[PDB]
């Protein structure tokens, strides 16, 4: 009764939290977005072909699952097109998406998008039985609960959760810095937090800010709790008539210019400094030109500290930094993200190795049958002439030599083009090649460090392909 | 399986579980008593502009539209409430004007989802008009973007008089219905007389009403339930003995009390025949029921038919023990109200409604007033400002000189600067002056309404009388002691 009500409470709370709160540690990818990328990979249409303008994709998404609104699925599409909010990059698109401005793109299917470049190598190896699957409620198609990865996007894109019990802030980071962190933890299981300070000088943004504190960053990467400073960029230049002109490019994150400017107008117009009727905040299609000019007989820095007291040019940005794994939430630190991603990639690589051994040893068994057929042929021909049935021919071949049923029938699959001797040598050559590759994979399976070397290989692949610098200029 | 070790998150998720199951299904709200899905239906029908003025529309499309504008919640209760607020007989008042297949009142809920073609009723025009009306906070949904209102404000305690169905969630409650006219009467008496007694409004208020038309006996339960909302009362069907041309008698019913099937009770009658626990009964017949409900039991002579009617309202389900439970919720926390306190919260809600509407209109008039202030100040010293624009260069110089000469703001100065020759006739100058003073008179009128609170009460009573004129409410039930 009340225990069953508690069971309903527990199970339904798990349903809501695993539905729309923080995703798994293993991916950092929410299942809405997971199914977006899975169905867009299963569109099959390459990003090389010009990216499409349709709600047919989202119609197949809603055929895959019924939410409490596919407008929310389109919101997920658009929020993954928010490069100014969520970093590089998940949408190859063309249509209206705006900026961090207060933009409303009601043109839903009229936007264009398809697969993105990072998604291509990000979600390979589906054909290698790497990830498990579950059936939908529609009992017709399957879906994976997690994904294979080529980086911890956990660190690449942060989290802005909701307070089902409590929300979660997770800051973004840099590509190559994360690669160096992976290499560091790979080479040493004995790293420190100063090591993390080295390979990660600090969390960054697609826009940029200033984070002056140090021990808040320290408690952030250790305890998982703490708040930081997000500060706008400040440039003090000289007006030709003597005004301390303020140029602003960076901002605190999730801070529109519009309502901040309106409250600045209000604070001017509530019996305060009114001679600052100089707000040249435009031309922001080349960058950000947020320029004011402080009036005469007034210093810029006092108005700067007053707008920092307005909590919009300098903001205490907190961090909750929680996660979901094994059905439980967790307070975060590193060597957890790190070791989790490491052992996940270990799973992926080793299971890929097992599947490749499956294909290779199956084809090796085939070429065994091929070479044993191509040893002695004409006696088999003449005994086939003493038969009239492929079942009789199968029994004859079982009397002749040791084969499989598949092997016997594949040897039956031989026209007269198969009756040469050069192709015997070719099958023998690829047979020895395949045996060498099988022995290579077996020796790799008897090698722990070789897995890490393959991880280094894929890291160097994506590092030659792409890199990124710290656009977020942070002084401490 | 579970393996969840932290009891704290179990408790927090359990509190969210309990309160969310509360919030989800039907609740005794402050302002509508409704399900939130009802609010969703109404707000979607309003902001799509689907009037009963315009013709009918396929409504499952509208259902999917609202479902996609809102959360991916399940279709079942959605289509259920879609039917329920279109059922004319169940809810006392008309909301949704369907067109298809429903089943009348006899246990056949026709659910033709393909045939879902409908409109609404004309009472939402009295219910809510918050387009410009700064009333209610909004919550955002699809990556947290699109509005959804918290409550359903109104000028009307109609949904007090409708009735509620919120039972199986935690504890049980409902709202039994009344009619509207004497409700308007007793409400207006509390309005003009803030210190009245209960029973003198029971002199104004008849029994709790029913759409079929019920025979009510007794008033002690009325005394208990108008105060404390608890107790069952007795209800009987309009049932008569009628003589033939032969002298044979007939039990003729007209209707039944609330939540009664014809057919299940008819099967129970056939039971009572084969149960052999009631005699005399010969004919159990029912015809021509669509011009008017006519079910007839017919009994042989020498049977004491009125004693058989007594046996009906003892043992059969024709007798109704209709119970009340009105256990309120005011801002989340569960409460319980008297009939006064309901209308009190209604009064102070109307206070905030008309005050905030008046302040929105005030800011309309103030902004347009600053506009026309700038226009008339531009009309004051025209040729000086002509010399100003012939002299100066920039926006800053123009705003500096206009603020130095006339002490106006920047938007006012630019709206001055946006004046073309075709608005320079003295005709339109004095039309600007005329409409300016018109808006001044409207500002003074709204400040006078801000001076005294009882004008709100008077206008409310006026439009209550307008609604009672367009919506005359005769009675259908019957009260006895």
How many domains is the backbone of chain A divided into? 1
Question: Ends of chain A: how far apart?
Answer: 58 Å
The rounded Rg of chain A comes to: 31 Å
The chain pair forming the largest interface, with residue counts per chain, is: A-B, 30 and 29 residues
What oligomeric arrangement do these chains adopt? part of a larger assembly
Content of β-strand of chain A: 5-15%
Largest sheet of chain A: 4 strands, antiparallel
Structural class of chain A: alpha+beta
Enumerate the strands of the largest sheet of chain A in spatial order, edge to edge or round the barrel.
Answer: 8-9-11-10
Overall geometry of chain A comes to elongated
Put simply, the count of helices of chain A is 17
- Total strands of chain A: the figure is 14
Helix content class of chain A: 40-55%
What does this structure look like?
It is classed as isomerase/dna. The entry lists the keywords topoisomerase, oligomeric complex, DNA complex, gyrase, T-segment, ISOMERASE-DNA complex. This is part of a larger assembly, with 2 copies of chain A. With 476 residues, the first copy, chain A, is an alpha+beta fold. The first copy, chain A, has one domain (1-476). Helices cover 46% and strands 10% of the residues of chain A. A 4-stranded antiparallel beta sheet of chain A has the order 8-9-11-10, with no helix packed on it. A two-stranded antiparallel sheet of chain A has the order 1-2. In chain A, a hairpin with an 8-residue loop joins strand 10 (279-281) and strand 11 (290-293). In chain A, helix 2 (31-41) packs across helix 3, helix 12 (337-375) packs across helix 15 and helix 14 packs across helix 15 (405-412). The radius of gyration of chain A is 31 Å and the shape is elongated. Chain A starts with a helix and ends in an 11-residue tail after the last helix. The interface between A and B is medium-sized, with 30 and 29 residues.
